[PDB]
Amino acid sequence: LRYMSRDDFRVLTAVEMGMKNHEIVPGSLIASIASLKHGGCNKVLRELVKHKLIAWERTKTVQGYRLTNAGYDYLALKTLSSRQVVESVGNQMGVGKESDIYIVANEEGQQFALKLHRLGRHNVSWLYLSRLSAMKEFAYMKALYERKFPVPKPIDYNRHAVVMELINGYPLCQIHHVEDPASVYDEAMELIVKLANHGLIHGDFNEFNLILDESDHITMIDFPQMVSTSHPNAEWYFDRDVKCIKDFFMKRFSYESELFPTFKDIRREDTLDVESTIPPELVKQKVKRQLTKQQKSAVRRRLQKGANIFTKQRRENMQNIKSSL
Amino acid sequence: FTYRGVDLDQLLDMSYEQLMQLYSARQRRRLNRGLRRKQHSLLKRLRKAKKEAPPMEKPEVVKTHLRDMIILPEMVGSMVGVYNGKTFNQVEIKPEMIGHYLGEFSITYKPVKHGRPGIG
């Protein structure tokens, strides 16, 4: 859990600065880009390694620290706490293969759902691929919610985290019986035509990507796989999804279709496939920026001398040599 | 009430042997295994409360730690708390449940009502 609420923000963000440019980030660089407190961040790092926040690396010459799976996760929740969306943790967790679903609660007590991307090449690239995944998923989630679709409501995105509306139900794959099979079938068939009207094909529109809300309402999740209708094989992915639903309701619920929708409508809706002259006050601002940069560069070099680990290794062997003489 | 074609009249006056041939498969094992020095002492303390009862009272509840004991037909009506691990319960001995054990009426666990799934 999150007890520590000051220095842990600045140090962990400084890791993320080095993670975007380089692999394993040395402890010398950290203190320079976290200039607010000097010297005492090395004991914070020793508290970070107690948790699954950072990992140590001392290979051959490469000495420093890299950010972990769980350590990257804490940074998003710390940002979402400042945006007043997350406060306490709900325990119902659906541990998946591509992502983890965590129930969150705000100041109000209103329960929302949180997605955390767990893509698993070094861990540096893996925690950058999860960054692009959340930004892409939130883009479609905003695009569909605005265009009348029955999707979870987008709230906030932070690096790899996506806060969505809490739609609680069961996935279609583990459903025994539906009270009204025909009305549910026609609802689902409409949604393929709906997407095709907006110039989109789901691609993998199966029973593994559909959730029933009280056996009345079909909910759609997971959107990184989506393709344009400008694609040469546009009608193939359209017909494969139709046949997947046609056979499933005939298999599980024994409902045969009276309606066979094969309409190509592109596009009647929004194309979502794309988805003395200088005043003294300015002189002050400009002189200030110069003076801050001179001090910041000097503080970097003071912090780069922290090597403290190099001095500790050299001292241990000298004591052994003198005693043996 | 009638158990195995034998009324509650005959069940009390029979021999100890003759009750076996009415019992179930697991129950005929144990009386030929023999009731032990502690379980000879639990059927004797139940003869006291029923006899010292007021005759309009079914007797006082007498505590015990022998869950596994069968209900013999002379135990019928004997209020006995049977222990679960934590604290006693109340089990009215009906004649309808002689073939069962005392342990199954002292319910061990509180049944699970789920709270929301946490961080999984």
mmCIF file of all heavy atoms in Angstrom, chain A residues 142-205, unseen atoms left out:
data_model
loop_
_atom_site.group_PDB
_atom_site.id
_atom_site.type_symbol
_atom_site.label_atom_id
_atom_site.label_comp_id
_atom_site.label_asym_id
_atom_site.label_seq_id
_atom_site.Cartn_x
_atom_site.Cartn_y
_atom_site.Cartn_z
ATOM 1 N N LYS A 142 -13.000 6.704 -26.005
ATOM 2 C CA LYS A 142 -13.574 8.048 -26.139
ATOM 3 C C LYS A 142 -14.358 8.196 -27.441
ATOM 4 O O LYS A 142 -15.425 8.820 -27.458
ATOM 5 C CB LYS A 142 -12.487 9.127 -26.060
ATOM 6 N N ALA A 143 -13.818 7.617 -28.519
ATOM 7 C CA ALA A 143 -14.410 7.701 -29.858
ATOM 8 C C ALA A 143 -15.757 6.990 -29.978
ATOM 9 O O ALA A 143 -16.640 7.463 -30.695
ATOM 10 C CB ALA A 143 -13.439 7.168 -30.902
ATOM 11 N N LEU A 144 -15.907 5.865 -29.276
ATOM 12 C CA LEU A 144 -17.138 5.071 -29.336
ATOM 13 C C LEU A 144 -18.226 5.564 -28.376
ATOM 14 O O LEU A 144 -19.408 5.552 -28.735
ATOM 15 C CB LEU A 144 -16.856 3.575 -29.126
ATOM 16 N N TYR A 145 -17.823 6.000 -27.181
ATOM 17 C CA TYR A 145 -18.748 6.535 -26.168
ATOM 18 C C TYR A 145 -19.455 7.816 -26.626
ATOM 19 O O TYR A 145 -20.630 8.030 -26.313
ATOM 20 C CB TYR A 145 -18.027 6.756 -24.830
ATOM 21 N N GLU A 146 -18.724 8.652 -27.362
ATOM 22 C CA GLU A 146 -19.269 9.870 -27.963
ATOM 23 C C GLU A 146 -20.210 9.580 -29.137
ATOM 24 O O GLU A 146 -21.083 10.395 -29.450
ATOM 25 C CB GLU A 146 -18.135 10.786 -28.427
ATOM 26 N N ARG A 147 -20.025 8.421 -29.773
ATOM 27 C CA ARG A 147 -20.796 8.033 -30.960
ATOM 28 C C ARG A 147 -21.866 6.954 -30.686
ATOM 29 O O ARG A 147 -22.122 6.084 -31.530
ATOM 30 C CB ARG A 147 -19.852 7.630 -32.111
ATOM 31 N N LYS A 148 -22.473 7.034 -29.495
ATOM 32 C CA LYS A 148 -23.670 6.257 -29.078
ATOM 33 C C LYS A 148 -23.472 4.764 -28.735
ATOM 34 O O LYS A 148 -24.441 4.081 -28.377
ATOM 35 C CB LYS A 148 -24.843 6.460 -30.059
ATOM 36 N N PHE A 149 -22.235 4.270 -28.830
ATOM 37 C CA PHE A 149 -21.918 2.852 -28.580
ATOM 38 C C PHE A 149 -22.021 2.437 -27.104
ATOM 39 O O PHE A 149 -21.722 3.244 -26.217
ATOM 40 C CB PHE A 149 -20.527 2.499 -29.122
ATOM 41 N N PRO A 150 -22.445 1.177 -26.841
ATOM 42 C CA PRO A 150 -22.501 0.646 -25.471
ATOM 43 C C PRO A 150 -21.136 0.167 -24.941
ATOM 44 O O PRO A 150 -20.921 -1.036 -24.737
ATOM 45 C CB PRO A 150 -23.506 -0.506 -25.588
ATOM 46 N N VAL A 151 -20.235 1.121 -24.720
ATOM 47 C CA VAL A 151 -18.892 0.860 -24.181
ATOM 48 C C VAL A 151 -18.731 1.476 -22.780
ATOM 49 O O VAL A 151 -19.505 2.372 -22.421
ATOM 50 C CB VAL A 151 -17.765 1.358 -25.134
ATOM 51 N N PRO A 152 -17.753 0.983 -21.976
ATOM 52 C CA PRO A 152 -17.394 1.667 -20.722
ATOM 53 C C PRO A 152 -16.972 3.123 -20.923
ATOM 54 O O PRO A 152 -16.313 3.447 -21.916
ATOM 55 C CB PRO A 152 -16.218 0.842 -20.201
ATOM 56 N N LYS A 153 -17.372 3.979 -19.984
ATOM 57 C CA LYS A 153 -17.113 5.416 -20.038
ATOM 58 C C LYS A 153 -15.665 5.737 -19.647
ATOM 59 O O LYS A 153 -15.247 5.422 -18.528
ATOM 60 C CB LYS A 153 -18.104 6.166 -19.141
ATOM 61 N N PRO A 154 -14.898 6.359 -20.572
ATOM 62 C CA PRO A 154 -13.525 6.797 -20.288
ATOM 63 C C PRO A 154 -13.473 7.941 -19.272
ATOM 64 O O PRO A 154 -14.251 8.898 -19.374
ATOM 65 C CB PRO A 154 -13.009 7.258 -21.657
ATOM 66 N N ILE A 155 -12.572 7.825 -18.297
ATOM 67 C CA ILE A 155 -12.436 8.814 -17.218
ATOM 68 C C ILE A 155 -11.058 9.496 -17.253
ATOM 69 O O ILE A 155 -10.979 10.715 -17.443
ATOM 70 C CB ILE A 155 -12.776 8.209 -15.823
ATOM 71 N N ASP A 156 -9.989 8.713 -17.072
ATOM 72 C CA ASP A 156 -8.609 9.231 -17.057
ATOM 73 C C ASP A 156 -7.585 8.188 -17.504
ATOM 74 O O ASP A 156 -7.762 6.987 -17.276
ATOM 75 C CB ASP A 156 -8.239 9.764 -15.660
ATOM 76 N N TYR A 157 -6.517 8.668 -18.146
ATOM 77 C CA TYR A 157 -5.390 7.830 -18.556
ATOM 78 C C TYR A 157 -4.068 8.337 -17.973
ATOM 79 O O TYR A 157 -3.769 9.535 -18.035
ATOM 80 C CB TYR A 157 -5.326 7.687 -20.089
ATOM 81 N N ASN A 158 -3.297 7.419 -17.393
ATOM 82 C CA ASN A 158 -1.988 7.734 -16.821
ATOM 83 C C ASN A 158 -0.945 6.676 -17.155
ATOM 84 O O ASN A 158 -0.860 5.637 -16.488
ATOM 85 C CB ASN A 158 -2.079 7.942 -15.301
ATOM 86 N N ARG A 159 -0.168 6.958 -18.206
ATOM 87 C CA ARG A 159 0.968 6.136 -18.668
ATOM 88 C C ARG A 159 0.589 4.755 -19.205
ATOM 89 O O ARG A 159 0.905 4.438 -20.347
ATOM 90 C CB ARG A 159 2.074 6.020 -17.596
ATOM 91 N N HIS A 160 -0.081 3.946 -18.384
ATOM 92 C CA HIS A 160 -0.521 2.596 -18.757
ATOM 93 C C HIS A 160 -1.897 2.271 -18.162
ATOM 94 O O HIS A 160 -2.507 1.251 -18.507
ATOM 95 C CB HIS A 160 0.507 1.562 -18.295
ATOM 96 N N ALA A 161 -2.363 3.145 -17.273
ATOM 97 C CA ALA A 161 -3.627 2.975 -16.558
ATOM 98 C C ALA A 161 -4.799 3.621 -17.293
ATOM 99 O O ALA A 161 -4.654 4.704 -17.863
ATOM 100 C CB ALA A 161 -3.505 3.535 -15.149
ATOM 101 N N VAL A 162 -5.946 2.938 -17.286
ATOM 102 C CA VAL A 162 -7.197 3.451 -17.866
ATOM 103 C C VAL A 162 -8.330 3.246 -16.855
ATOM 104 O O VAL A 162 -8.628 2.110 -16.471
ATOM 105 C CB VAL A 162 -7.540 2.778 -19.232
ATOM 106 N N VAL A 163 -8.941 4.350 -16.427
ATOM 107 C CA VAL A 163 -10.104 4.303 -15.534
ATOM 108 C C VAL A 163 -11.377 4.300 -16.385
ATOM 109 O O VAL A 163 -11.580 5.189 -17.221
ATOM 110 C CB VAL A 163 -10.140 5.471 -14.512
ATOM 111 N N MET A 164 -12.215 3.291 -16.161
ATOM 112 C CA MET A 164 -13.456 3.108 -16.917
ATOM 113 C C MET A 164 -14.683 2.953 -16.008
ATOM 114 O O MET A 164 -14.545 2.749 -14.796
ATOM 115 C CB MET A 164 -13.332 1.925 -17.897
ATOM 116 N N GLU A 165 -15.869 3.068 -16.607
ATOM 117 C CA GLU A 165 -17.143 2.849 -15.919
ATOM 118 C C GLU A 165 -17.278 1.384 -15.506
ATOM 119 O O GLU A 165 -16.976 0.477 -16.290
ATOM 120 C CB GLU A 165 -18.316 3.262 -16.818
ATOM 121 N N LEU A 166 -17.725 1.173 -14.270
ATOM 122 C CA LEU A 166 -17.880 -0.164 -13.709
ATOM 123 C C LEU A 166 -19.148 -0.854 -14.226
ATOM 124 O O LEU A 166 -20.240 -0.693 -13.663
ATOM 125 C CB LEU A 166 -17.843 -0.111 -12.171
ATOM 126 N N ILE A 167 -18.987 -1.602 -15.318
ATOM 127 C CA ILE A 167 -20.038 -2.480 -15.834
ATOM 128 C C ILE A 167 -19.715 -3.898 -15.359
ATOM 129 O O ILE A 167 -18.754 -4.525 -15.826
ATOM 130 C CB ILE A 167 -20.204 -2.386 -17.377
ATOM 131 N N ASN A 168 -20.517 -4.375 -14.407
ATOM 132 C CA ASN A 168 -20.299 -5.675 -13.776
ATOM 133 C C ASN A 168 -21.249 -6.731 -14.335
ATOM 134 O O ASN A 168 -22.476 -6.591 -14.259
ATOM 135 C CB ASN A 168 -20.427 -5.564 -12.249
ATOM 136 N N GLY A 169 -20.658 -7.780 -14.903
ATOM 137 C CA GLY A 169 -21.394 -8.912 -15.460
ATOM 138 C C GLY A 169 -20.499 -10.112 -15.697
ATOM 139 O O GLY A 169 -19.407 -10.214 -15.125
ATOM 140 N N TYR A 170 -20.971 -11.026 -16.543
ATOM 141 C CA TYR A 170 -20.220 -12.225 -16.904
ATOM 142 C C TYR A 170 -19.925 -12.254 -18.406
ATOM 143 O O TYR A 170 -20.790 -11.875 -19.206
ATOM 144 C CB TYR A 170 -20.983 -13.491 -16.496
ATOM 145 N N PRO A 171 -18.700 -12.688 -18.795
ATOM 146 C CA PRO A 171 -18.366 -12.875 -20.215
ATOM 147 C C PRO A 171 -19.231 -13.943 -20.883
ATOM 148 O O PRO A 171 -19.619 -14.924 -20.237
ATOM 149 C CB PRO A 171 -16.900 -13.320 -20.177
ATOM 150 N N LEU A 172 -19.510 -13.738 -22.170
ATOM 151 C CA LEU A 172 -20.446 -14.562 -22.953
ATOM 152 C C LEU A 172 -20.052 -16.041 -23.087
ATOM 153 O O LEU A 172 -20.913 -16.900 -23.302
ATOM 154 C CB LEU A 172 -20.659 -13.926 -24.337
ATOM 155 N N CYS A 173 -18.755 -16.321 -22.942
ATOM 156 C CA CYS A 173 -18.211 -17.679 -23.023
ATOM 157 C C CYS A 173 -18.676 -18.605 -21.892
ATOM 158 O O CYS A 173 -18.794 -19.817 -22.099
ATOM 159 C CB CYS A 173 -16.679 -17.642 -23.076
ATOM 160 N N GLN A 174 -18.927 -18.036 -20.713
ATOM 161 C CA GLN A 174 -19.392 -18.809 -19.548
ATOM 162 C C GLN A 174 -20.871 -18.546 -19.181
ATOM 163 O O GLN A 174 -21.237 -18.465 -18.001
ATOM 164 C CB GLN A 174 -18.435 -18.655 -18.345
ATOM 165 N N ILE A 175 -21.708 -18.435 -20.211
ATOM 166 C CA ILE A 175 -23.148 -18.225 -20.044
ATOM 167 C C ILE A 175 -23.909 -19.490 -20.445
ATOM 168 O O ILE A 175 -23.764 -19.987 -21.565
ATOM 169 C CB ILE A 175 -23.644 -16.972 -20.829
ATOM 170 N N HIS A 176 -24.711 -20.000 -19.512
ATOM 171 C CA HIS A 176 -25.527 -21.188 -19.742
ATOM 172 C C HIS A 176 -26.762 -20.863 -20.589
ATOM 173 O O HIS A 176 -26.893 -21.367 -21.708
ATOM 174 C CB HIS A 176 -25.916 -21.845 -18.410
ATOM 175 N N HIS A 177 -27.650 -20.019 -20.057
ATOM 176 C CA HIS A 177 -28.915 -19.689 -20.718
ATOM 177 C C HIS A 177 -29.245 -18.194 -20.697
ATOM 178 O O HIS A 177 -28.930 -17.486 -19.734
ATOM 179 C CB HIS A 177 -30.071 -20.505 -20.119
ATOM 180 N N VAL A 178 -29.873 -17.737 -21.780
ATOM 181 C CA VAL A 178 -30.406 -16.377 -21.892
ATOM 182 C C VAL A 178 -31.926 -16.471 -22.043
ATOM 183 O O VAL A 178 -32.432 -17.235 -22.875
ATOM 184 C CB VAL A 178 -29.758 -15.584 -23.061
ATOM 185 N N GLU A 179 -32.630 -15.695 -21.219
ATOM 186 C CA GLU A 179 -34.098 -15.664 -21.167
ATOM 187 C C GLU A 179 -34.744 -15.268 -22.503
ATOM 188 O O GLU A 179 -35.759 -15.849 -22.902
ATOM 189 C CB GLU A 179 -34.567 -14.728 -20.046
ATOM 190 N N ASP A 180 -34.148 -14.281 -23.176
ATOM 191 C CA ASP A 180 -34.570 -13.855 -24.507
ATOM 192 C C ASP A 180 -33.368 -13.900 -25.462
ATOM 193 O O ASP A 180 -32.608 -12.928 -25.542
ATOM 194 C CB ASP A 180 -35.200 -12.452 -24.455
ATOM 195 N N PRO A 181 -33.185 -15.034 -26.177
ATOM 196 C CA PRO A 181 -32.042 -15.205 -27.085
ATOM 197 C C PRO A 181 -32.113 -14.321 -28.334
ATOM 198 O O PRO A 181 -31.080 -13.806 -28.775
ATOM 199 C CB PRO A 181 -32.114 -16.691 -27.479
ATOM 200 N N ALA A 182 -33.323 -14.149 -28.875
ATOM 201 C CA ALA A 182 -33.557 -13.421 -30.127
ATOM 202 C C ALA A 182 -33.244 -11.923 -30.047
ATOM 203 O O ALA A 182 -32.613 -11.371 -30.956
ATOM 204 C CB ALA A 182 -34.984 -13.645 -30.611
ATOM 205 N N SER A 183 -33.686 -11.283 -28.962
ATOM 206 C CA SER A 183 -33.470 -9.850 -28.727
ATOM 207 C C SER A 183 -32.002 -9.518 -28.459
ATOM 208 O O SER A 183 -31.520 -8.453 -28.856
ATOM 209 C CB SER A 183 -34.342 -9.356 -27.570
ATOM 210 N N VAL A 184 -31.311 -10.436 -27.783
ATOM 211 C CA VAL A 184 -29.871 -10.334 -27.527
ATOM 212 C C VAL A 184 -29.083 -10.518 -28.832
ATOM 213 O O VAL A 184 -28.118 -9.792 -29.084
ATOM 214 C CB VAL A 184 -29.419 -11.320 -26.408
ATOM 215 N N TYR A 185 -29.523 -11.471 -29.659
ATOM 216 C CA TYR A 185 -28.916 -11.725 -30.971
ATOM 217 C C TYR A 185 -28.992 -10.511 -31.907
ATOM 218 O O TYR A 185 -27.996 -10.153 -32.535
ATOM 219 C CB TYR A 185 -29.541 -12.962 -31.635
ATOM 220 N N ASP A 186 -30.175 -9.898 -31.990
ATOM 221 C CA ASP A 186 -30.411 -8.729 -32.845
ATOM 222 C C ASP A 186 -29.673 -7.477 -32.368
ATOM 223 O O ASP A 186 -29.297 -6.628 -33.182
ATOM 224 C CB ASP A 186 -31.915 -8.447 -32.982
ATOM 225 N N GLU A 187 -29.474 -7.380 -31.052
ATOM 226 C CA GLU A 187 -28.673 -6.324 -30.429
ATOM 227 C C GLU A 187 -27.217 -6.410 -30.893
ATOM 228 O O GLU A 187 -26.628 -5.399 -31.281
ATOM 229 C CB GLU A 187 -28.757 -6.422 -28.898
ATOM 230 N N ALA A 188 -26.663 -7.624 -30.861
ATOM 231 C CA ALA A 188 -25.275 -7.895 -31.246
ATOM 232 C C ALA A 188 -25.015 -7.700 -32.741
ATOM 233 O O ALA A 188 -23.958 -7.190 -33.125
ATOM 234 C CB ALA A 188 -24.863 -9.295 -30.810
ATOM 235 N N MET A 189 -25.979 -8.115 -33.568
ATOM 236 C CA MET A 189 -25.902 -7.971 -35.027
ATOM 237 C C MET A 189 -25.924 -6.509 -35.461
ATOM 238 O O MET A 189 -25.278 -6.142 -36.449
ATOM 239 C CB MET A 189 -27.031 -8.739 -35.728
ATOM 240 N N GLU A 190 -26.669 -5.694 -34.714
ATOM 241 C CA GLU A 190 -26.739 -4.247 -34.913
ATOM 242 C C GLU A 190 -25.381 -3.578 -34.680
ATOM 243 O O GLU A 190 -25.024 -2.642 -35.394
ATOM 244 C CB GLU A 190 -27.798 -3.634 -33.990
ATOM 245 N N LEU A 191 -24.636 -4.082 -33.693
ATOM 246 C CA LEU A 191 -23.350 -3.501 -33.281
ATOM 247 C C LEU A 191 -22.206 -3.716 -34.275
ATOM 248 O O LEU A 191 -21.249 -2.937 -34.292
ATOM 249 C CB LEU A 191 -22.947 -3.994 -31.881
ATOM 250 N N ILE A 192 -22.308 -4.766 -35.092
ATOM 251 C CA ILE A 192 -21.348 -5.018 -36.180
ATOM 252 C C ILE A 192 -21.621 -4.049 -37.337
ATOM 253 O O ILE A 192 -20.685 -3.506 -37.933
ATOM 254 C CB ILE A 192 -21.385 -6.486 -36.689
ATOM 255 N N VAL A 193 -22.907 -3.841 -37.632
ATOM 256 C CA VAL A 193 -23.365 -2.892 -38.658
ATOM 257 C C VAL A 193 -23.102 -1.449 -38.201
ATOM 258 O O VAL A 193 -22.726 -0.600 -39.017
ATOM 259 C CB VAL A 193 -24.860 -3.113 -39.031
ATOM 260 N N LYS A 194 -23.295 -1.191 -36.903
ATOM 261 C CA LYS A 194 -22.970 0.094 -36.268
ATOM 262 C C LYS A 194 -21.509 0.492 -36.471
ATOM 263 O O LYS A 194 -21.228 1.627 -36.853
ATOM 264 C CB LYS A 194 -23.280 0.054 -34.771
ATOM 265 N N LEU A 195 -20.594 -0.445 -36.219
ATOM 266 C CA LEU A 195 -19.155 -0.219 -36.392
ATOM 267 C C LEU A 195 -18.767 -0.041 -37.859
ATOM 268 O O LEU A 195 -17.955 0.831 -38.181
ATOM 269 C CB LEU A 195 -18.334 -1.347 -35.747
ATOM 270 N N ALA A 196 -19.359 -0.860 -38.731
ATOM 271 C CA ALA A 196 -19.167 -0.771 -40.185
ATOM 272 C C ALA A 196 -19.672 0.554 -40.762
ATOM 273 O O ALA A 196 -19.103 1.067 -41.728
ATOM 274 C CB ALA A 196 -19.835 -1.945 -40.883
ATOM 275 N N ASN A 197 -20.732 1.092 -40.155
ATOM 276 C CA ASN A 197 -21.283 2.410 -40.496
ATOM 277 C C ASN A 197 -20.317 3.541 -40.130
ATOM 278 O O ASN A 197 -20.223 4.540 -40.853
ATOM 279 C CB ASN A 197 -22.640 2.618 -39.803
ATOM 280 N N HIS A 198 -19.605 3.373 -39.013
ATOM 281 C CA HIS A 198 -18.565 4.313 -38.574
ATOM 282 C C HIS A 198 -17.201 4.038 -39.228
ATOM 283 O O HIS A 198 -16.209 4.710 -38.921
ATOM 284 C CB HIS A 198 -18.454 4.305 -37.044
ATOM 285 N N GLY A 199 -17.170 3.059 -40.135
ATOM 286 C CA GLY A 199 -15.967 2.692 -40.882
ATOM 287 C C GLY A 199 -14.969 1.896 -40.064
ATOM 288 O O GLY A 199 -13.766 2.167 -40.111
ATOM 289 N N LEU A 200 -15.470 0.910 -39.321
ATOM 290 C CA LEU A 200 -14.650 0.071 -38.444
ATOM 291 C C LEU A 200 -15.053 -1.396 -38.507
ATOM 292 O O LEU A 200 -16.236 -1.721 -38.639
ATOM 293 C CB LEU A 200 -14.746 0.551 -36.990
ATOM 294 N N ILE A 201 -14.055 -2.273 -38.425
ATOM 295 C CA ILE A 201 -14.282 -3.713 -38.265
ATOM 296 C C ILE A 201 -13.510 -4.173 -37.026
ATOM 297 O O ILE A 201 -12.314 -3.887 -36.889
ATOM 298 C CB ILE A 201 -13.865 -4.538 -39.512
ATOM 299 N N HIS A 202 -14.214 -4.872 -36.134
ATOM 300 C CA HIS A 202 -13.669 -5.343 -34.854
ATOM 301 C C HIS A 202 -12.490 -6.300 -35.038
ATOM 302 O O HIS A 202 -11.491 -6.200 -34.318
ATOM 303 C CB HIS A 202 -14.769 -6.000 -34.016
ATOM 304 N N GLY A 203 -12.615 -7.215 -36.000
ATOM 305 C CA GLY A 203 -11.561 -8.181 -36.319
ATOM 306 C C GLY A 203 -11.688 -9.478 -35.545
ATOM 307 O O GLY A 203 -11.710 -10.561 -36.138
ATOM 308 N N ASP A 204 -11.764 -9.361 -34.221
ATOM 309 C CA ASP A 204 -11.899 -10.511 -33.326
ATOM 310 C C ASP A 204 -13.170 -10.397 -32.472
ATOM 311 O O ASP A 204 -13.126 -10.457 -31.233
ATOM 312 C CB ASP A 204 -10.633 -10.666 -32.463
ATOM 313 N N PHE A 205 -14.299 -10.230 -33.158
ATOM 314 C CA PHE A 205 -15.604 -10.090 -32.515
ATOM 315 C C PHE A 205 -16.170 -11.472 -32.166
ATOM 316 O O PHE A 205 -16.997 -12.037 -32.894
ATOM 317 C CB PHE A 205 -16.549 -9.283 -33.413
#
